[PDB]
Structures are given as structure tokens and as C-alpha cells.
């Protein structure tokens, strides 16, 4: 027979194995698919890479300390320089993709703590100034693979234009005014260190359009929260890494133009 805990995910030129996963989630019960002719918007001849963009990429790792309040990513953004997925989103005006999101975090049996991994469509976050609304720079809004962080202090500045262009990423309100305890409405999986060392979520493209412009819109974001604190009891300050590995799937593009080169720092 086969266990539920043990699994192998293969896409493109890459494979991820795991021996401790709580199955896998297919958000809303649907798999990424290619656009059906009957729903297509553009009349351009689409580009459909098979095994170029559709491979797993590993994002820069983050560290889980007992003082972290969480981490976040905008999904298309976190893969913007990732080989061919990166190049195709900049060469084409339009693009669409689903994703396989795999989150990894090791701990020993003497460790405790839990990470909630949530995928939030349209993960819109609040500005960090009380003098303006819906105010955030392109650059701060789209940090890349680095992601961003959550805090537990709301310290807006109604006078400092620079800080006001950063997000007000409160952990308990998920950066947008919603209590985190209701985050569970979104597809999610929990990396409870006494149960799992990983989580996998399959993500369909979800939008009001069949296809959109990737340099403008982040279809989904990734939120990871320390639902339960990390502890080891054999140290004053334990630390374990968290690594997020992502593959686009059933990817297509249209609107070929000169490569887009966004404002950056």
C-alpha cells in the first residue's frame, strides 16, 4: 500500500518528495487548466511553454525565530526573475498561470510550533500612512522572492512620505483589517511541527478575467503565520528555516512586445 504522508510531485525538470505531508489541497476543488476556446478574450496566438516555466523554483529562505510575526509574498511577483517564467511574464503583456505551492519547514520531535500557510487571492494590503489611502509604491508593493514580513505594531506615519509607501503589515489583521483567525476561509494547510514538515497547495488561476497583465496584478499572495510559537527547550532562542518552493503550471501568454522592465531598486 501507500501512505498519505509520503508523496512525490514532478513537474518539468524538477521533483519534490516528502515523507511528512498532510495530503495536499486543491483549492476550490479545481486544477489549473488552459483557457478553453469558448472563454478566450485575446485573439492572439498564445504561447504555451511546456517544461520551461513549469518547473519548481526555490525562493530565498526565511528564518523562523520565536519573535517572527509572519512572512508574505505576492505570487507572480515572487517568480519575476525565475528563469523562463520570469522572462515570459516580462516579454508578454498578458499571461496566466496556476501554481503548485510547496512550503517546507523541518524540526525535531522535541520542537513545537505551527505554521499556517494560506493562499489569498487578491491579497490587498493597507498603506502605512494615515494621510493617504491605497498608497504604496510599486517597489514596496512588489518585493520579489524576498517577500515581506508581518509585524504586530501599527506605526503609520502621517508625515513621513517614505514609510507611508510601505505596507502596514499587521499580523493579527493580515495587513488588511481582517482578523487572522478567519484566514482559514482561504485554502490553507498547517505545518504543525509534530505532524508535518511540509504543505502543498494546488492553485487554479482565479480572476474576473480569463487572462490579465502580470506586471500589474498579483493573482494570489502567500501568507505564512506562526499560529503556534516555536520552542525547543534546549536553547534560549531556537531557529528553524522556512522555505517556499513554487512552480507555475498550465501557463500561457499573449501580447508579445518588448521586454517590460519595471521600476526597481
Amino acid at each position: 500500500g501507500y501512505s498519505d504522508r509520503v508523496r512525490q510531485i514532478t513537474l518539468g525538470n524538477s521533483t519534490i518528495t516528502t515523507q511528512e505531508a498532510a495530503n495536499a489541497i486543491v483549492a476550490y476543488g479545481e486544477w489549473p487548466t488552459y483557457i478553453n476556446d469558448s472563454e478566450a478574450n485575446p485573439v492572439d496566438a498564445p504561447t504555451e511553454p511546456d517544461v520551461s516555466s513549469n518547473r519548481f523554483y526555490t525562493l530565498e529562505s526565511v528564518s523562523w525565530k520565536t519573535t517572527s510575526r509572519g512572512w508574505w509574498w505576492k505570487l507572480p511577483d515572487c517568480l519575476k526573475d525565475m528563469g523562463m517564467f520570469g522572462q515570459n511574464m516580462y516579454y508578454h503583456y498578458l499571461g496566466r498561470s496556476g501554481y503548485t505551492i510547496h512550503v517546507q519547514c523541518n524540526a525535531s520531535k522535541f520542537h513545537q510550533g505551527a505554521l499556517g500557510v494560506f493562499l489569498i487571492p487578491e491579497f490587498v494590503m493597507a498603506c502605512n500612512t494615515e494621510s493617504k489611502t491605497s498608497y504604496v509604491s510599486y517597489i514596496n508593493a512588489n518585493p520579489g522572492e524576498r517577500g515581506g514580513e508581518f509585524t504586530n505594531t501599527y506605526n503609520p506615519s502621517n508625515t513621513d512620505a517614505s514609510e507611508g509607501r510601505k505596507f502596514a503589515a499587521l499580523d493579527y489583521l493580515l495587513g488588511s483589517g481582517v482578523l487572522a483567525g478567519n484566514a482559514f476561509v482561504y485554502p490553507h494547510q498547517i505545518i504543525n511541527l509534530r505532524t508535518n514538515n511540509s504543505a502543498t497547495i494546488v492553485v487554479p488561476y482565479v480572476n474576473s478575467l480569463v487572462i490579465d497583465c502580470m506586471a500589474k496584478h498579483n493573482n494570489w499572495g502567500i501568507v505564512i503565520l506562526p499560529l503556534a510559537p516555536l520552542a525547543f527547550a534546549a536553547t534560549s532562542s531556537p531557529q528553524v528555516p522556512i522555505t517556499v518552493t513554487i512552480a507555475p503550471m498550465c501557463t500561457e501568454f499573449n501580447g508579445l512586445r518588448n521586454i517590460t522592465v519595471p521600476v526597481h531598486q
Binding site: V6, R7, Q8, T10, L11, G12, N13, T15, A24
Partner: protein, 283 residues
């Protein structure tokens, strides 16, 4: 017409999200990993028409190798009469390339093709007229009498196989059927030829260890059959062997270091087979 079987073809395959895990296994089981590219990456359909022809044991072994070189001296000097003929123990041991291939297996059974090659020159500073030479290769089975001299009676070869070669003709050649007493030749023998019994307890003297103590394939007695001439001829006789129709059993690794003699003995000056690498991360 029957097409020889090819090596494994690759089927096309797509992505996987299942509980099956071809990539994870155990080797503690004694099994090698069994994964192929279609188990870990997406693949295209490729028809494989290649065959393992050169890797077959017949192909691997089917080359003549020089095994030994014998030295014959045809001379008018009385002090060199004893060198007019020579006697060699039959073995593959003398040359590294052939014993190395054979030692990949613990046991083997094969017929043997032998070819001899003769080369001659004048070792003297003063060369001169010499008539064309003829050579005799006589096989002396274990227990058979051996010549004490080049003109001894044993050269009559009344019971022994004997091949005569006139110098300058095509190199002489013959086929020898498998002759082992066992049902295969053993390339190794972890044991003694005789069991020493209680009452004769010594460490030294136990020179009966290894296959070397139980293998006697006779000797090749090689003779110039000509009368001595005023000008000395020095002849190099190369003995070649080609195992054929060979079956092997119980594979073992090849030797990493230089051989010391007939057994598996190591040389203390040469037990370091690998090169140094600058670092584990060198590439």
C-alpha cells in the same frame, strides 16, 4: 531475420502529484536504486536502437593479449648452450592487462586461442651470415618429462603436442579446449593446497595458500631447432592468448593497485590508487 534486443527506450511522461514515490527507496535492502528519467523528470518518447554489443563478455574478452615474452639464444659459445631453449610456466599472471580483465570474475570457463610471434636480432657487435631459423614449441603437460637440454630426447614429442614454425611465415596459432579439472577455472582460491595436520605446527612453510598452489597447466618448452651458427641469434618469443566462448561467474571489482607476483599481494610503495582533489566542492 531477428533484430538483436536494444537497451531501454524512454516513454513519454507528464507531471505527477501522487503518493507513488519512485525517487525514494532504501539501499539497505541490498538493492540498487531502480529509478530511470521517466520517474523523476518529464520525458519525450525516444526509441532506443542501441545494443550492448561491445559490452558482451565475448566481446570484452575476445582480444589476444600478450602474456609473456621468452628469450632463446642460438649460439656457438659453449657457455650459452643452456640458453638455446627455454621453459615457461603457463599462466596469464605475467601480464597485467589480461589478468585484470579475467579478475573481474571469480570463476570462468573458456576455450583458449594461442598465437606466437617471433622476433629475432643479433645481440653481438659482429653480425654475419646466418641461415633461416626454425622454432619448436612443445607442450609438456603436468607430470610429463622436461628436456634438460635443447637436444634432449623429450623434444621428439611422441606424446606431446608440438608446433613447428619456420621463421618468416605467418605467426603459428592453435586452439586449446577448456582443460580445467574443475567445472570452471577458479581465478581465486581462498584456501590451501594441503591441510597441515596437528603434529607439524609452523607458520613458515605454508606456501600452499592461494590458487597458485593448485594450478599446473604444464609448460611451454621452446627451442631453436637449428645448429649453432658463428653469429649469435637472440630470439624474442611473444606468447599471446585470447579467451573465447567464455562464461563467467560471480563478479567482483577490478584491482585498484599494482600487482605483486602471482597472488593478490600489495606493494607497500603503491597502495594509493586515487588522486587528490582540492576540495569536496571542486567540480
Amino acid at each position: 531475420v531477428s533484430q538483436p534486443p536494444s537497451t531501454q527506450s524512454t516513454e513519454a511522461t507528464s507531471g505527477v502529484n501522487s503518493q507513488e514515490v519512485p525517487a525514494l527507496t532504501a539501499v539497505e535492502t541490498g538493492a540498487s536504486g531502480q529509478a530511470i528519467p521517466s520517474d523523476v523528470v518529464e520525458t519525450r518518447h525516444v526509441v532506443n536502437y542501441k545494443t550492448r554489443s561491445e559490452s558482451c563478455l565475448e566481446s570484452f574478452f575476445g582480444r589476444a593479449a600478450c602474456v609473456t615474452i621468452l628469450s632463446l639464444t642460438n649460439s656457438s659459445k659453449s657457455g650459452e648452450e643452456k640458453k638455446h631453449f627455454n621453459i615457461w610456466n603457463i599462466t596469464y599472471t605475467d601480464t597485467v592487462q589480461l589478468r585484470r580483465k579475467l579478475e573481474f570474475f571469480t570463476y570462468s570457463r573458456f576455450d583458449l586461442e594461442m598465437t606466437f610471434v617471433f622476433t629475432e636480432n643479433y645481440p653481438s657487435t659482429a653480425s654475419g651470415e646466418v641461415r633461416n631459423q626454425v622454432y619448436q614449441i612443445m607442450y609438456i603437460p603436468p607430470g610429463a618429462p622436461r628436456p634438460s637440454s635443447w637436444d634432449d630426447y623429450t623434444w621428439q614429442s611422441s606424446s606431446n603436442p608440438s608446433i613447428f614454425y619456420m621463421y618468416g611465415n605467418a605467426p603459428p596459432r592453435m586452439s586449446i579446449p577448456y582443460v580445467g579439472i574443475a567445472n570452471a577455472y577458479s581465478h581465486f582460491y581462498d584456501g590451501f593446497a594441503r591441510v597441515p595436520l596437528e603434529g607439524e605446527n609452523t607458520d613458515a612453510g605454508d606456501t600452499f595458500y592461494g590458487l597458485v598452489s593448485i594450478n599446473d597447466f604444464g609448460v611451454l618448452a621452446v627451442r631453436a631447432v637449428n645448429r649453432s651458427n658463428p653469429h649469435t641469434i637472440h630470439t624474442s618469443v611473444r606468447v599471446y592468448m585470447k579467451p573465447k566462448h567464455i562464461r563467467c561467474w560471480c563478479p567482483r571489482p577490478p584491482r585498484a593497485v599494482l600487482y605483486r607476483g602471482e597472488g593478490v599481494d600489495m606493494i607497500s610503495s603503491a597502495i594509493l590508487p586515487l588522486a587528490k582533489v582540492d576540495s569536496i566542492t571542486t567540480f
